[PDB]
Design a protein around this motif. Structure first.
Motif, PDB file in Angstrom:
ATOM      1  N   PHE A 110       0.808  -1.291   0.000  1.00 61.17           N
ATOM      2  CA  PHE A 110       0.000   0.000   0.000  1.00 61.17           C
ATOM      3  C   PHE A 110       0.817   1.305   0.000  1.00 61.17           C
ATOM      4  O   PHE A 110       0.270   2.332  -0.371  1.00 61.17           O
ATOM      5  N   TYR A 111       2.092   1.331   0.406  1.00 57.35           N
ATOM      6  CA  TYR A 111       2.830   2.656   0.383  1.00 57.35           C
ATOM      7  C   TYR A 111       2.925   3.238  -1.025  1.00 57.35           C
ATOM      8  O   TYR A 111       3.385   4.364  -1.194  1.00 57.35           O
ATOM      9  N   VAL A 112       2.537   2.497  -2.026  1.00 59.69           N
ATOM     10  CA  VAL A 112       2.636   2.981  -3.422  1.00 59.69           C
ATOM     11  C   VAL A 112       1.270   2.989  -4.103  1.00 59.69           C
ATOM     12  O   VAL A 112       1.016   3.834  -4.957  1.00 59.69           O
ATOM     13  N   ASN A 113       0.386   2.054  -3.755  1.00 58.54           N
ATOM     14  CA  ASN A 113      -0.938   2.014  -4.402  1.00 58.54           C
ATOM     15  C   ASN A 113      -1.920   2.893  -3.640  1.00 58.54           C
ATOM     16  O   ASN A 113      -2.705   3.616  -4.245  1.00 58.54           O
ATOM     17  N   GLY A 114      -1.872   2.861  -2.313  1.00 58.39           N
ATOM     18  CA  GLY A 114      -2.769   3.701  -1.508  1.00 58.39           C
ATOM     19  C   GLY A 114      -3.506   2.862  -0.466  1.00 58.39           C
ATOM     20  O   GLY A 114      -3.765   1.683  -0.671  1.00 58.39           O
ATOM     21  N   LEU A 115      -3.871   3.487   0.645  1.00 56.90           N
ATOM     22  CA  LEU A 115      -4.642   2.750   1.733  1.00 56.90           C
ATOM     23  C   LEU A 115      -6.102   2.705   1.313  1.00 56.90           C
ATOM     24  O   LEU A 115      -6.421   2.896   0.141  1.00 56.90           O
ATOM     25  N   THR A 116      -6.992   2.473   2.258  1.00 65.10           N
ATOM     26  CA  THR A 116      -8.408   2.415   1.966  1.00 65.10           C
ATOM     27  C   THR A 116      -9.120   2.672   3.244  1.00 65.10           C
ATOM     28  O   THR A 116      -8.819   2.059   4.252  1.00 65.10           O
ATOM     29  N   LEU A 117     -10.019   3.584   3.217  1.00 64.10           N
ATOM     30  CA  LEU A 117     -10.793   3.946   4.421  1.00 64.10           C
ATOM     31  C   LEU A 117     -12.255   4.081   4.055  1.00 64.10           C
ATOM     32  O   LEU A 117     -12.690   5.070   3.492  1.00 64.10           O
ATOM     33  N   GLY A 118     -13.010   3.045   4.347  1.00 64.49           N
ATOM     34  CA  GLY A 118     -14.457   3.019   4.022  1.00 64.49           C
ATOM     35  C   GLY A 118     -14.615   2.779   2.532  1.00 64.49           C
ATOM     36  O   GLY A 118     -15.556   3.261   1.915  1.00 64.49           O
ATOM     37  N   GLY A 119     -13.681   2.043   1.943  1.00 61.64           N
ATOM     38  CA  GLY A 119     -13.736   1.762   0.483  1.00 61.64           C
ATOM     39  C   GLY A 119     -13.185   2.962  -0.299  1.00 61.64           C
ATOM     40  O   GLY A 119     -13.317   3.012  -1.516  1.00 61.64           O
ATOM     41  N   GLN A 120     -12.547   3.937   0.386  1.00 67.65           N
ATOM     42  CA  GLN A 120     -11.979   5.126  -0.356  1.00 67.65           C
ATOM     43  C   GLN A 120     -10.462   4.999  -0.408  1.00 67.65           C
ATOM     44  O   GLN A 120      -9.767   5.226   0.571  1.00 67.65           O
ATOM     45  N   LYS A 121      -9.963   4.631  -1.550  1.00 70.08           N
ATOM     46  CA  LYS A 121      -8.499   4.456  -1.743  1.00 70.08           C
ATOM     47  C   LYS A 121      -7.764   5.799  -1.639  1.00 70.08           C
ATOM     48  O   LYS A 121      -7.825   6.612  -2.560  1.00 70.08           O
ATOM     49  N   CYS A 122      -7.009   6.008  -0.565  1.00 66.66           N
ATOM     50  CA  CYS A 122      -6.196   7.255  -0.444  1.00 66.66           C
ATOM     51  C   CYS A 122      -4.758   6.850  -0.755  1.00 66.66           C
ATOM     52  O   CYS A 122      -4.528   5.752  -1.240  1.00 66.66           O
ATOM     53  N   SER A 123      -3.802   7.708  -0.542  1.00 69.48           N
ATOM     54  CA  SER A 123      -2.386   7.340  -0.927  1.00 69.48           C
ATOM     55  C   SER A 123      -1.342   7.845   0.027  1.00 69.48           C
ATOM     56  O   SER A 123      -0.974   9.015   0.013  1.00 69.48           O
ATOM     57  N   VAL A 124      -0.814   6.966   0.812  1.00 70.99           N
ATOM     58  CA  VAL A 124       0.266   7.331   1.784  1.00 70.99           C
ATOM     59  C   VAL A 124       1.330   8.167   1.124  1.00 70.99           C
ATOM     60  O   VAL A 124       1.938   7.778   0.127  1.00 70.99           O
ATOM     61  N   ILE A 125       1.569   9.285   1.711  1.00 72.23           N
ATOM     62  CA  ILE A 125       2.590  10.195   1.246  1.00 72.23           C
ATOM     63  C   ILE A 125       3.367  10.630   2.510  1.00 72.23           C
ATOM     64  O   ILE A 125       3.203  11.678   3.038  1.00 72.23           O
ATOM     65  N   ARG A 126       4.150   9.709   2.984  1.00 76.98           N
ATOM     66  CA  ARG A 126       5.017   9.818   4.241  1.00 76.98           C
ATOM     67  C   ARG A 126       4.458   8.851   5.280  1.00 76.98           C
ATOM     68  O   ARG A 126       3.870   9.260   6.283  1.00 76.98           O
TER      69      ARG A 126
ATOM     70  N   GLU B  97       6.580   9.776  15.233  1.00 78.50           N
ATOM     71  CA  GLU B  97       5.685  10.442  14.253  1.00 78.50           C
ATOM     72  C   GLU B  97       4.203   9.951  14.286  1.00 78.50           C
ATOM     73  O   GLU B  97       3.283  10.744  14.381  1.00 78.50           O
ATOM     74  N   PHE B  98       3.998   8.664  14.077  1.00 74.46           N
ATOM     75  CA  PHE B  98       2.598   8.060  13.939  1.00 74.46           C
ATOM     76  C   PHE B  98       1.734   8.826  12.887  1.00 74.46           C
ATOM     77  O   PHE B  98       0.552   8.588  12.819  1.00 74.46           O
ATOM     78  N   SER B  99       2.297   9.714  12.063  1.00 70.12           N
ATOM     79  CA  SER B  99       1.448  10.449  11.049  1.00 70.12           C
ATOM     80  C   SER B  99       1.734   9.925   9.670  1.00 70.12           C
ATOM     81  O   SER B  99       2.852   9.555   9.343  1.00 70.12           O
ATOM     82  N   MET B 100       0.708   9.865   8.874  1.00 72.73           N
ATOM     83  CA  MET B 100       0.823   9.334   7.494  1.00 72.73           C
ATOM     84  C   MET B 100       0.032  10.251   6.562  1.00 72.73           C
ATOM     85  O   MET B 100      -1.113  10.508   6.812  1.00 72.73           O
ATOM     86  N   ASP B 101       0.628  10.767   5.490  1.00 72.00           N
ATOM     87  CA  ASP B 101      -0.149  11.684   4.582  1.00 72.00           C
ATOM     88  C   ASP B 101      -0.799  10.880   3.456  1.00 72.00           C
ATOM     89  O   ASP B 101      -0.339  10.902   2.318  1.00 72.00           O
ATOM     90  N   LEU B 102      -1.901  10.203   3.727  1.00 69.40           N
ATOM     91  CA  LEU B 102      -2.546   9.424   2.640  1.00 69.40           C
ATOM     92  C   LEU B 102      -3.618  10.267   2.010  1.00 69.40           C
ATOM     93  O   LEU B 102      -4.590  10.640   2.632  1.00 69.40           O
ATOM     94  N   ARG B 103      -3.381  10.651   0.763  1.00 70.31           N
ATOM     95  CA  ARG B 103      -4.333  11.574   0.060  1.00 70.31           C
ATOM     96  C   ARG B 103      -5.101  10.881  -1.048  1.00 70.31           C
ATOM     97  O   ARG B 103      -4.594  10.006  -1.728  1.00 70.31           O
ATOM     98  N   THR B 104      -6.309  11.342  -1.273  1.00 71.95           N
ATOM     99  CA  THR B 104      -7.137  10.805  -2.381  1.00 71.95           C
ATOM    100  C   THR B 104      -6.470  11.269  -3.660  1.00 71.95           C
ATOM    101  O   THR B 104      -6.471  12.455  -3.944  1.00 71.95           O
ATOM    102  N   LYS B 105      -5.870  10.393  -4.417  1.00 72.52           N
ATOM    103  CA  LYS B 105      -5.203  10.846  -5.615  1.00 72.52           C
ATOM    104  C   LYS B 105      -6.191  10.674  -6.766  1.00 72.52           C
ATOM    105  O   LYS B 105      -7.030   9.778  -6.756  1.00 72.52           O
ATOM    106  N   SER B 106      -6.127  11.556  -7.718  1.00 72.77           N
ATOM    107  CA  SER B 106      -7.092  11.535  -8.878  1.00 72.77           C
ATOM    108  C   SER B 106      -6.571  10.677 -10.034  1.00 72.77           C
ATOM    109  O   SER B 106      -5.426  10.246 -10.048  1.00 72.77           O
ATOM    110  N   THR B 107      -7.444  10.437 -11.011  1.00 78.73           N
ATOM    111  CA  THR B 107      -7.072   9.610 -12.205  1.00 78.73           C
ATOM    112  C   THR B 107      -7.983   9.974 -13.390  1.00 78.73           C
ATOM    113  O   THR B 107      -9.158   9.627 -13.401  1.00 78.73           O
ATOM    114  N   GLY B 108      -7.445  10.655 -14.391  1.00 76.68           N
ATOM    115  CA  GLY B 108      -8.266  11.041 -15.595  1.00 76.68           C
ATOM    116  C   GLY B 108      -8.765  12.483 -15.453  1.00 76.68           C
ATOM    117  O   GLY B 108      -9.923  12.775 -15.729  1.00 76.68           O
TER     118      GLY B 108
END
Length: 139
Positions: A58-74, A82-93
């Motif tokens: 998942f550090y490259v494809n993205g996590l998932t929270l409630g079926g919403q694929k976000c994307s770890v960015i740190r 730290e315990f912080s992770m920047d997983l953002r909803t990345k767009s496509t198209g």
């Protein structure tokens, strides 16, 4: 009460939109996630990746929270100072992106969803504080 105040964040945060404090123990649970959005629907599947022992996937494809694929960015959700992770909803198209900061304690899985065109730094600050209570919670 208390948990709802860290939900009062998303509401008082002029940056965050959703939020999910989740008891990700053996059986996952939503200790306090703004319902009606998507995070509160967090099961051990979306949490299996948000907290899975996997050390590379998942550090490259993205996590998932409630079926919403976000994307770890740190990925720093595990207390290496730290315990912080920047997983953002990345767009496509030509889609619009958004960002989520996800923090983790020793017994909880805090998430901070947020989006106005969101940068992903003020949510990282509001997740550090959402978990600042879960750190003062001794959980």
């Amino acid at each position: 009460a208390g948990w709802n105040a860290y939900i009062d964040n998303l509401m008082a945060d002029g940056t965050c939109q959703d939020a999910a404090i989740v008891g990700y123990k053996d059986s996952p649970s939503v200790w306090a996630a703004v319902p009606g959005k998507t995070f509160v629907n967090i099961t051990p599947a979306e949490v299996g990746v948000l907290v899975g022992k996997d050390r590379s996937s998942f550090y490259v494809n993205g996590l998932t929270l409630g079926g919403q694929k976000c994307s770890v960015i740190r990925d720093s959700l595990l207390q290496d100072g730290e315990f912080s992770m920047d997983l953002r909803t990345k767009s496509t198209g030509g889609a619009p992106t958004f960002n989520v900061t996800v923090t983790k304690t020793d017994k909880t899985l805090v998430l901070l969803m947020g989006k106005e065109g969101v940068h992903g730094g003020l949510i990282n600050k509001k997740c550090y504080e959402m978990a600042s209570h879960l750190r003062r919670s001794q959980y």
